Structure 1
Amino acid sequence: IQMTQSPSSLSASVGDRVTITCRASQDVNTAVAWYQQKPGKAPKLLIYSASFLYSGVPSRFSGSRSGTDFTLTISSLQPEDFATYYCQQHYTTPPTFGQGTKVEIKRTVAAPSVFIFPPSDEQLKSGTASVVCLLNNFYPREAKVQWKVDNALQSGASQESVTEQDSKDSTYSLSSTLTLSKAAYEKHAVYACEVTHQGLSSPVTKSFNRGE
């Protein structure tokens, strides 16, 4: 028995009413549970037997059933409900989970603060050079970070990482790391990261001249 969960992700604001649905591939009676999982932690039971609020779960969570369709409702979305939610059937063995629903908090647009870091002298000693561009406290999550070495656009020498949504201000932060050999790093002069984001009227560039 499969569990088709929708949507895969959603964005809603604090206080919004949120609906997550899950369709069982066949009858599963009411043998259905809903779980919440926060980054870095074990899943946590919210609803059991389709509609029963689990002890200690806030009353804004509820579940209901209509045939093969099951629905989790959060009446008033809170900042602390940033998580992935999972539906699960245990009508037959093996029990199966839905594929999850990423819930993020909607907030106003916030432009990133941008910083660029040259490679440390210690790292250059070992023969590698990492250049790090930081985008701090922005929303939405989507952003475009391009590396330019001597005003030439780079391809496939950088990796990105994004933090989870911040608990207070609901923003994201992002790092982009350009990795080069020491020899290649010493052959160029200007290192720049160029940032395009909804919160910026025009792209922001931070740069440095190697050695200066």
Structure 2
Amino acid sequence: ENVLTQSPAIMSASPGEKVTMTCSASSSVNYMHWYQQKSSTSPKLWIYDTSKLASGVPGRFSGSGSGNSYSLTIRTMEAEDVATYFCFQASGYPLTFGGGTKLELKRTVAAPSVFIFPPSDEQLKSGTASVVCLLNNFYPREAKVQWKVDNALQSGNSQESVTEQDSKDSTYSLSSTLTLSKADYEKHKVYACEVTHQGLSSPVTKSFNRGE
């Protein structure tokens, strides 16, 4: 098969900035096509036959290339262009897709707002205590969240999940969920999550004491 290589796999651009993503075919093709996919919903046809825009695609997009060498360009990056772009060839079977280039919007630094949630009483009756730390609306993506229970650093008992870049404000949000047995949850007093992020002069700590 005719392997298509898109590198770099991830790039960022500030608003207004020109961006160019490449696609290399191992074997020469007469035409290259491209798709845009936002957040695991159906891809959309974006450019066909190397340089033709599909319907609904704004004029700031263009495509070029020939032989083994193709590109897609955005004249001026906008927040709505945050997506994964896939090249695709249909000149020979099997039909093949590139691995994707995910394009991020590089906006200004924004500090998370941090919230801590204790387990619900309803959950505790079941025998488990999930404690949630929420980092809301921050940029850039890199952030460290540590859980501290009566001053001891937890490890191996928490999981993080992160949103995609928000449509309008280009920020992330992040949850961190500490799971303990009820018995262990009742053995300790102070539950703290500690957040380190380049928007904060020093770490933020949000805590509670089980009880109220």
The residue aligned with 1:120 is 120
The answer to whether the 8 A contact 2:30-2:66 is kept is no
Give every structure 1 segment of 4 or more consecutive aligned residues whose post-TM-superposition deviation is greater than 3 Å. none
Counterpart residue identity of residue 50, structure 2: A
Aligned residues: 211
- Aligned pairs for 1:70-149 (under 5 A) are 70-149=70-149
Alignment check: 8 A CA contact 2:61 2:75 kept: yes
2:155 match = 155
Task: Compute the displacement of 1:67 (Å).
Answer: 2.5
**Residue of structure 1 equivalent to 2:52:** 52
Q: Identity over the aligned pairs, expressed in percent? A: 76
Equivalent residue, structure 2, for 1:211:
211
Q: TM-score, normalised by structure 2?
A: 0.97
**TM-score, with normalisation over the residues of structure 1?**
0.97
Two-structure CA RMSD over aligned residues (Å):
0.9
One-letter code aligned to 2:143: A
Structure 1 equivalent of residue 63 of structure 2: 63
How far the C-alpha of 1:168 sits from its partner, in A, is 1.7
Structure-1 separation of matches of 2:4 and 2:63: 15
The answer for unaligned runs of 5 or more in structure 2 is none
Q: CA deviation at 1:165?
A: 1.1
Q: Displacement of 1:55 after TM fit?
A: 2.3
Partner of 2:22: 21
Other-structure match for 2:10: 9
Deviation by residue 1:125-146 (Cα, 9 ceiling, x = unmatched): 1110000000011000110000
